[PDB]
Design a protein around this ligand. Structure first.
Ligand code: 9ER
Ligand code: FMN
Length: 436
């Protein structure tokens, strides 16, 4: 009798759900193709098997969409067995909040990376949540748009009697906004710490003044480009946490020795105690002066580069090696300082774009529906006006198909994540499996 319905949903859902089904499948397929390509070797069978198991999960949801298409096509009538309605809807819920958790985990881990670079599994939860749906009588019958003909609805009614809808709905909507708040401030802190003006430290060891000149040219290149440059001689520095509070550290040293590949006198005290500064997890660059007449051309460059690798430092650019006089190739020196910026700028752009994306997905996909839910549930339970009921029901049709776009957007995020966070991710995966 209370025929509260949105007639546009019977035309809006079959088209949207059939577009997000093809775009969904294509998106998921483009992930697998790209991933299986970037890891062709059998030594990476476990990272590929994980990527297959992720696609399989996404696919288990994508196969529920034709049921809804047919359900809406025949004007909101669930003809198929009732237990299938429990299954279809239960999988929507599991997919929705797993898509939320995963966009949460991407944000949290990028947060632990862009900031602070120095019970857990929810298996127990989604077991109780799924077993709740298994017993839920999701189906109610109501007469058709005309009358004298029962049309079965799937998850459209709230039986006020036995199920405590109100608290379950309040809990979930608040749990989402807690998660959204965490994503919101994690990402804004990421944007803020990336947009922070970069402070660089240049430490040079020079006898004849050649490394000193290169260090000056590099310093003028970064300062011109807006860096907080701290250029200091190796004889005026102390190994005690020298690199602390510096984004980029540029170490420069001239090669010496009649016999073997020895370092510059002022630079050797720093070399021996390079751990004490804070080399691990530090973006470092290594330039240096020399001569092609000797066997180890710029041996000092190669000496600190392999030593910083053993220290686990981030060598952002291929070390600068000068043949004789640095004034002879000032444009080649500047080129290296320009490239050094460029390489650090890309890593920043990577995380800027990721933070924006996870927010744009949250603000357009998940957030609109979770705002609409609490007013809509109350209206359905009969706690509001007639005019309002129609409005909140109509917007619910729009927000529900916007929340369904997660199908296509999460594989797109996984693609950009594979394509640009490859090194970090591959390391993370094989560290967890190394014990359990
Ligand atoms: C806890 C709360 C916030 C919440 C509750 C439900 C329930 C209606 C089970 C559901 C839910 C599970 S299945 C489903 N729908 C929408 C029904 N709505 C009209 C009440 C079934 C459905 C799926 C896709 C397209 N049309 C209908 N809704 C969802 C999903 C958005 C995850 C969230
Ligand atoms: C005895 C001696 C040994 C040197 N050994 C090397 C060497 O092994 N490899 C190299 O590339 N340059 C070597 N050099 C060249 C210096 O690195 C070169 O003079 C440099 O351009 C000057 O840098 P500096 O003025 O900043 O100290 C050596 C020079 C001398 C005099």
């Amino acid at each position: 009798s209370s025929h509260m319905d949105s007639e546009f949903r019977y035309t809006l859902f079959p088209i949207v759900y059939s577009i997000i089904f093809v775009l969904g499948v294509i998106a998921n397929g483009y992930v697998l193709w790209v991933f299986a390509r970037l890891y062709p070797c059998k030594k990476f069978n476990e990272i590929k098997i994980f990527m297959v198991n992720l696609t399989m999960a996404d696919m288990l949801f994508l196969i529920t969409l034709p049921l809804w298409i047919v359900y809406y096509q025949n004007q909101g009538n669930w003809i198929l067995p009732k237990f299938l309605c429990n299954v279809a809807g239960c999988l929507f819920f599991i997919n929705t909040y797993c898509s939320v958790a995963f966009l949460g985990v991407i944000t949290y881990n990028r947060y632990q990376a862009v900031t602070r670079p120095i019970s857990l599994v929810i298996w127990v939860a989604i077991v109780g949540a799924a077993s709740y749906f298994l017993i839920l009588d999701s189906t109610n019958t109501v007469p058709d748009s005309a009358g004298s003909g029962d049309v079965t609805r799937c998850f459209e009614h709230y039986e006020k009697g036995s199920v405590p809808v109100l608290i379950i709905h309040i809990f979930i909507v608040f749990s989402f906004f807690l998660v959204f708040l965490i994503i919101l401030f994690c990402n804004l802190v990421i944007i803020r710490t990336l947009l922070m003006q970069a402070k660089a430290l240049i430490v040079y060891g020079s006898t004849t003044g050649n490394t000193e000149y290169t260090a000056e040219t590099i310093a003028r290149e970064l300062a011109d480009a807006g860096y907080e440059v701290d250029s200091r001689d190796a004889a005026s520095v102390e190994a005690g946490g020298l690199f602390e509070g510096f984004d980029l550290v540029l170490l420069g040293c001239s090669t010496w020795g009649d016999d073997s590949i020895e370092l510059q006198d002022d630079f050797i005290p720093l070399f021996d105690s390079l751990e004490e500064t804070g080399a691990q997890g530090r973006k470092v660059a290594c330039f240096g002066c020399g001569d092609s007449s000797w066997e180890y051309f710029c041996g000092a460059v190669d000496a600190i580069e392999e030593k910083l690798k053993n220290l686990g430092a981030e060598i952002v650019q291929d070390g600068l090696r000068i043949d004789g006089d640095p004034r002879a190739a000032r444009d080649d020196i500047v080129g290296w300082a320009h490239d050094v910026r460029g390489a650090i700028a890309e890593v920043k752009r990577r995380d800027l774009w990721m933070a924006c994306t996870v927010l744009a997905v949250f603000i357009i996909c998940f957030v609109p529906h979770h705002v609409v839910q609490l007013p809509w549930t109350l209206a359905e339970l009969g706690f509001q006006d007639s005019k309002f009921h129609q409005a909140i029901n109509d917007a619910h049709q729009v927000t529900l198909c916007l929340l369904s776009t997660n199908c296509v957007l999460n594989p797109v995020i996984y693609c950009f994540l594979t394509k640009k966070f490859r090194k970090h991710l591959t390391e993370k995966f094989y560290s967890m499996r190394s014990s359990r």
